[PDB]
Design a protein around this ligand. Sequence first.
Ligand SMILES: CC(C)C[C@H]1c2[nH]c3cc(OC4CCCC4)ccc3c2C[C@H]2C(=O)N[C@@H](CCC(=O)OC(C)(C)C)C(=O)N21
Ligand SMILES: CC(C)C[C@H]1c2[nH]c3cc(OC4CCCC4)ccc3c2C[C@H]2C(=O)N[C@@H](CCC(=O)OC(C)(C)C)C(=O)N21
Ligand SMILES: CC(C)CCC[C@@H](C)[C@H]1CC[C@H]2[C@@H]3CC=C4C[C@@H](O)CC[C@]4(C)[C@H]3CC[C@]12C
Ligand SMILES: CC(C)CCC[C@@H](C)[C@H]1CC[C@H]2[C@@H]3CC=C4C[C@@H](O)CC[C@]4(C)[C@H]3CC[C@]12C
Ligand SMILES: CC(C)CCC[C@@H](C)[C@H]1CC[C@H]2[C@@H]3CC=C4C[C@@H](O)CC[C@]4(C)[C@H]3CC[C@]12C
Ligand SMILES: CC(C)CCC[C@@H](C)[C@H]1CC[C@H]2[C@@H]3CC=C4C[C@@H](O)CC[C@]4(C)[C@H]3CC[C@]12C
Ligand SMILES: CC(C)CCC[C@@H](C)[C@H]1CC[C@H]2[C@@H]3CC=C4C[C@@H](O)CC[C@]4(C)[C@H]3CC[C@]12C
Ligand SMILES: CC(C)CCC[C@@H](C)[C@H]1CC[C@H]2[C@@H]3CC=C4C[C@@H](O)CC[C@]4(C)[C@H]3CC[C@]12C
Ligand SMILES: CC(C)CCC[C@@H](C)[C@H]1CC[C@H]2[C@@H]3CC=C4C[C@@H](O)CC[C@]4(C)[C@H]3CC[C@]12C
Ligand SMILES: CC(C)CCC[C@@H](C)[C@H]1CC[C@H]2[C@@H]3CC=C4C[C@@H](O)CC[C@]4(C)[C@H]3CC[C@]12C
Ligand SMILES: CC(C)CCC[C@@H](C)[C@H]1CC[C@H]2[C@@H]3CC=C4C[C@@H](O)CC[C@]4(C)[C@H]3CC[C@]12C
Ligand SMILES: CC(C)CCC[C@@H](C)[C@H]1CC[C@H]2[C@@H]3CC=C4C[C@@H](O)CC[C@]4(C)[C@H]3CC[C@]12C
Lengths: 572, 572
Amino acid sequence: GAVLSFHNICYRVKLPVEKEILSNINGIMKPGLNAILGPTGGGKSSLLDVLAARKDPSGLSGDVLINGAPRPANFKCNSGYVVQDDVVMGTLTVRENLQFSAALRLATTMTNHEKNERINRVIQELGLDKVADSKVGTQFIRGVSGGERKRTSIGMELITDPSILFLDEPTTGLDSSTANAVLLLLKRMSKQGRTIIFSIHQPRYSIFKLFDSLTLLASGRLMFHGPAQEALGYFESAGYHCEAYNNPADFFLDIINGDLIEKLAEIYVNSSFYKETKAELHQLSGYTTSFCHQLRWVSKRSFKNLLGNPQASIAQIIVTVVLGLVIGAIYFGLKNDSTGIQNRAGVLFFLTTNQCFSSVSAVELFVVEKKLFIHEYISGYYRVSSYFLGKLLSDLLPMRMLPSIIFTCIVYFMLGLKPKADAFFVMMFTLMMVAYSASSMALAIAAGQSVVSVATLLMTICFVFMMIFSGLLVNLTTIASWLSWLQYFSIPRYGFTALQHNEFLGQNFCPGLNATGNNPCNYATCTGEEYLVKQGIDLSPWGLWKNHVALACMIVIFLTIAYLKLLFLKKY
Amino acid sequence: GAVLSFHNICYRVKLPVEKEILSNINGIMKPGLNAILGPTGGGKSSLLDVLAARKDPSGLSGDVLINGAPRPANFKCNSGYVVQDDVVMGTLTVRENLQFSAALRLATTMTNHEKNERINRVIQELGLDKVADSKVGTQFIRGVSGGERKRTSIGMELITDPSILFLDEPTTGLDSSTANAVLLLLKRMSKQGRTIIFSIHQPRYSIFKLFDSLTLLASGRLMFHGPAQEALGYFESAGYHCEAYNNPADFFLDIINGDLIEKLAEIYVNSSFYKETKAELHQLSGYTTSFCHQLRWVSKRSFKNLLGNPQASIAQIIVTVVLGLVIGAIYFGLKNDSTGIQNRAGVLFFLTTNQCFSSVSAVELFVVEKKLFIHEYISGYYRVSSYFLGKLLSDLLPMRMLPSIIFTCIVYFMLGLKPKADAFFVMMFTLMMVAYSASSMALAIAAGQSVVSVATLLMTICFVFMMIFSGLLVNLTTIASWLSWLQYFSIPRYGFTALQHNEFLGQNFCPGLNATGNNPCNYATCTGEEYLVKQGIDLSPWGLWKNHVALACMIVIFLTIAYLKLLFLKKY
Ligand SMILES: CC(C)C[C@H]1c2[nH]c3cc(OC4CCCC4)ccc3c2C[C@H]2C(=O)N[C@@H](CCC(=O)OC(C)(C)C)C(=O)N21
Ligand SMILES: CC(C)C[C@H]1c2[nH]c3cc(OC4CCCC4)ccc3c2C[C@H]2C(=O)N[C@@H](CCC(=O)OC(C)(C)C)C(=O)N21
Ligand SMILES: CC(C)CCC[C@@H](C)[C@H]1CC[C@H]2[C@@H]3CC=C4C[C@@H](O)CC[C@]4(C)[C@H]3CC[C@]12C
Ligand SMILES: CC(C)CCC[C@@H](C)[C@H]1CC[C@H]2[C@@H]3CC=C4C[C@@H](O)CC[C@]4(C)[C@H]3CC[C@]12C
Ligand SMILES: CC(C)CCC[C@@H](C)[C@H]1CC[C@H]2[C@@H]3CC=C4C[C@@H](O)CC[C@]4(C)[C@H]3CC[C@]12C
Ligand SMILES: CC(C)CCC[C@@H](C)[C@H]1CC[C@H]2[C@@H]3CC=C4C[C@@H](O)CC[C@]4(C)[C@H]3CC[C@]12C
Ligand SMILES: CC(C)CCC[C@@H](C)[C@H]1CC[C@H]2[C@@H]3CC=C4C[C@@H](O)CC[C@]4(C)[C@H]3CC[C@]12C
Ligand SMILES: CC(C)CCC[C@@H](C)[C@H]1CC[C@H]2[C@@H]3CC=C4C[C@@H](O)CC[C@]4(C)[C@H]3CC[C@]12C
Ligand SMILES: CC(C)CCC[C@@H](C)[C@H]1CC[C@H]2[C@@H]3CC=C4C[C@@H](O)CC[C@]4(C)[C@H]3CC[C@]12C
Ligand SMILES: CC(C)CCC[C@@H](C)[C@H]1CC[C@H]2[C@@H]3CC=C4C[C@@H](O)CC[C@]4(C)[C@H]3CC[C@]12C
Ligand SMILES: CC(C)CCC[C@@H](C)[C@H]1CC[C@H]2[C@@H]3CC=C4C[C@@H](O)CC[C@]4(C)[C@H]3CC[C@]12C
Ligand SMILES: CC(C)CCC[C@@H](C)[C@H]1CC[C@H]2[C@@H]3CC=C4C[C@@H](O)CC[C@]4(C)[C@H]3CC[C@]12C
């Protein structure tokens, strides 16, 4: 098996206040089962992220060396890593998660039969054969238990057959017998020859008896490294008395807590386990798949997540149908009189600002899947471009095509707008473009963040500053010229100007007029063009289509900013 | 000290699926330190809530009896209870929390000097004298450490000098040496003669050596009850071998988990610790303060929380000032021409719907303080009426008076609305009433819930169905008569109709007119009354003030519904 042998690791970060969180750590990890103990604030998870190259090579100041050689560039694609909180797809089943991982991690050369036999072998080794085709589980659907979610998360990284297998906290978040079952599974894996390296948090003695090698850390300094049975005898030789009926790992943490660390670290420097470790270390020292493949599998997984999550996808269509029926019931039969201007401008304003505010629920998209994106980009399933295009083609495109089609098909014929063939399609296309553009601004603000609330609030602030300049509330010509340049930034202004220019052309709003008051008395606003001029809207068809080209360019700019915020994200 | 002696407790709930979660449990708890162990799903916290009467007496089916007598009605006011997650005020300091608890729990007869000496004694017994006047801590301000927060939460219930002191999970959420310090404090309390009863979760042996009496529970059934030293010897006599270097409490849970419960519960029925317990049990068996006082202290605490939380109180005033300056900059100098109708109706619509949507941030009020309300109502600090009126007089009144005054004083004179003395005050009063009414609907929907998101979303749905019927988007006379009755439910319609009737009276919107087109040609909308009629608004002053009486009655109805949702809440 592999022998991961790290020597003289110094590590430091910038919080810019610079601080070392690993001081001087060396150790050898045999084929077998290697554990890392310590407090939360100690460097246990930091050292585990360092050995799997999950932290940036800028701060790392020592050689990490496997089997006699430094770590190659293919190492992250070769050595699996298992996150603390599970990143499995809750809506997909256990076989389809392994199908996804086998499709992206393994080569394109292999047969589907070979990958299916590999998945069957991996799901046989885990004991997930009873639940091989049930859903993993979310809030709305009941699913598989937490220990079998953790076995699924291990099995996703077992597909590529890793030589070294890392594990961040496989015990925590679980109950006791569940944790013992997971660790007995890990021991059965480690007897094969696979080198398991894991960090944990306050284990039991039934856990602690299983360990092959131990590494204790505290406040960034190495406290012990040797075989795990030898550790209690070493701390008896250090002078700390162990009491009867006490867990030795709890005794190890009780040494750290003080019933000092610079006093206790130097005691390990004067050990027999330290000179032997240096005597071993100085002996040793002195993409895969194409683009369309990644886009197809990412888009397939995200669409299957969209079907398997029924509530936030179906409920938007239900609210769209109900609100379309309500707007068809209130504005029913738009007349051509003095109320016709107010009703038509009001319903077009409601439809565009409804599209804008209903596109706030796409903040959720790149924020819920953030840790899964980081883990799967470092582990090397896909590029950022294929993730981005797959998750646009999957979750953004149909869930913004369908509500705008439903709004136009419902509120068009109940209201009785301009009864032409193409005006219907221009209205449908304008609502679809304002939906895409508002949702693309949502993705531009929301991508690469961890919380939903600040991005949602910022979207709503931007929209209430756009709807002032939309043109119903203020007249755009009466804004001062040092402030009227902000009207180009606003998406409802383009959607609403396009809909007003679509609908107000052939209409007359003075019944029985036939020039009674001599082109009626200069204050009438009778024909639709006379309204549409004094709003500041052009009458030529470029006055229609410049709104759509402005929306298309805002889609392109906002999706490019969203892509650059995903691409320049701190992945480590 | 007190001897809490419970006998033959059977307990069951309705989830309506009916299920027993405590089967047949009896035990005696001496003066000293009593622990309750078990799994999470076991009845440890349920039995601890039963003994302190924190669960309803409907499901309870056995006598709980202290010191030879059943529990009186004053018992919750006499025996302290300490919640798992701390309910201390994060913004108040450690001395002012104890000042609050001493003001509400103790009598009105006692001197302020006596209560201050009591608080000094309690804060001396805890070891909080170094941090006696520092803030407890929230997100924005750094504060006291978690163990000293837990000592503060114990000290809040130590004020009334309880005979019996309950504690739900005093170890969890903490680190190891912190937990040992808290439990050594508890042992120092229990040596005085105070009967401490607590539930915990997987303790250490340094914890477990301190116990005076033990009660193990599993799946609703009693597993052991006796002295805590005797428990391991009893389970050796049961036939379960304990291994060396193993925590006995972890061994107790490992017996439960199965390395059955109906097999293992009957073994305790055949004990020597069970017949002795029945031999002891059958021997034994066979507001404070006025209303204005509670309102004063609750309102004082909530106002001090409003000052000590600077961000969500100051940031609303900053956003109000900035948005008032923006609306003063866009709509600057409202002219009297064909754009005058559109600009005035637009800015009045923006101001009212701004008041409505900015009153969504009062959903937070009764939802953040929900567990603190339940705990302090059961422990008996205040009635529901005094909590409700204090938290209206503290957080609702000034934070909705100040933004409306700021909006009116800024956007009034920059826009140049109707330059009178009383029109300014009618505008300020209408904005204040629409703020109160929207926020009162927020409190009516939001009170008595635990999550913020569903109530916030429901507020926003109600507001977008109110703003259609406000009167700018649709003309209210052109709505069909089977649907035009919904216009009375909507708060922006009353605020916006009152502002339009306030502002559109003395205005003329046709310059240089002097009857050129013979009362100009029937389609002009020149004078303000001709606009204000065709909207459906009365011209008499009752057409102004019926909006304010509708807003006042919606304030009264919504605050009454909020009060009834607090009063009829399931407190147990
Ligand atoms: C769809 C509608 C009922 C809610 C939608 C929405 N329209 C708005 C339109 C606005 O124009 C104003 C009308 C008069 C002048 C301007 C203003 C605000 C809004 C909002 C709020 C927004 C929201 O807060 N969230 C999303 C998704 C909510 C959702 O998913 O709801 C269910 C029940 C779970 C399905 C949304 O759709 N709205
Ligand atoms: C104050 C404003 C900038 C935000 C406010 C608000 N106005 C609205 C007005 C609306 O009318 C439409 C305007 C054209 C016709 C109808 C519609 C929606 C809104 C919203 C959103 C609402 C909200 O989402 N909640 C609080 C946020 C306060 C807050 O805590 O944010 C800071 C920055 C941290 C202080 C709010 O006040 N807004
Ligand atoms: C009438 C409206 C809603 C039509 C909108 C078009 C939608 C439904 C289309 C456009 C792009 C499509 C996706 C394109 C590519 C793939 C990859 C394939 O391996 C599974 C299907 C999947 C994920 C498609 C699902 C359906 C899809 C999202
Ligand atoms: C979004 C999806 C569902 C619909 C897309 C809208 C399409 C079909 C619409 C939007 C713009 C429309 C065009 C707008 C103007 C004209 C000029 C006139 O000679 C009628 C046909 C023609 C050329 C229309 C054809 C249909 C059209 C291209
Ligand atoms: C009429 C006006 C006020 C409407 C609002 C337009 C302006 C203010 C909006 C529209 C596009 C927005 C930007 C979109 C994308 C990003 C990238 C993100 O990493 C920070 C916020 C930032 C930089 C946004 C800031 C605000 C923004 C520039
Ligand atoms: C990151 C954010 C700020 C990017 C915003 C880009 C905006 C401001 C740009 C992108 C596309 C642009 C439009 C493209 C084309 C035209 C037609 C021209 O005859 C008038 C200007 C107008 C209507 C532009 C206005 C400004 C515009 C909408
Ligand atoms: C006119 C409107 C509807 C078109 C929609 C614009 C879409 C299709 C555009 C805008 C931003 C674009 C992305 C911008 C940057 C990159 C990085 C490049 O290495 C691969 C392509 C990729 C990922 C682009 C794919 C296509 C893209 C998503
Ligand atoms: C100009 C505007 C903002 C004025 C609004 C009035 C506000 C500031 C007033 C009205 C009611 C007042 C409260 C009434 C009673 C008490 C109890 C007292 O023991 C502490 C002050 C406290 C909590 C007051 C704080 C200030 C208060 C909230
Ligand atoms: C909320 C706070 C800050 C302001 C309260 C507004 C008060 C002061 C306003 C609102 C309604 C106003 C009244 C409305 C109508 C009239 C009739 C006329 O003869 C002028 C005075 C008088 C009688 C006003 C006096 C001031 C008044 C009572
Ligand atoms: C113009 C119309 C559509 C405006 C909307 C008004 C109606 C639908 C609103 C206003 C007041 C609201 C109620 C206020 C209080 C409560 C009590 C709460 O426990 C359940 C919701 C419930 C029962 C709300 C339901 C919706 C409600 C009745
Ligand atoms: C729980 C919710 C639904 C309660 C809502 C109560 C609403 C519908 C009630 C309470 C007060 C009422 C108003 C009280 C007084 C008047 C004056 C009268 O000349 C016309 C009706 C009008 C304007 C009422 C309309 C309906 C009204 C606003
Ligand atoms: C016209 C507007 C501004 C007045 C505001 C209405 C306020 C003051 C009213 C409306 C609802 C009322 C509450 C309704 C019910 C009760 C329960 C009772 O046992 C004590 C009083 C108490 C708690 C009331 C106090 C006063 C109250 C909060």
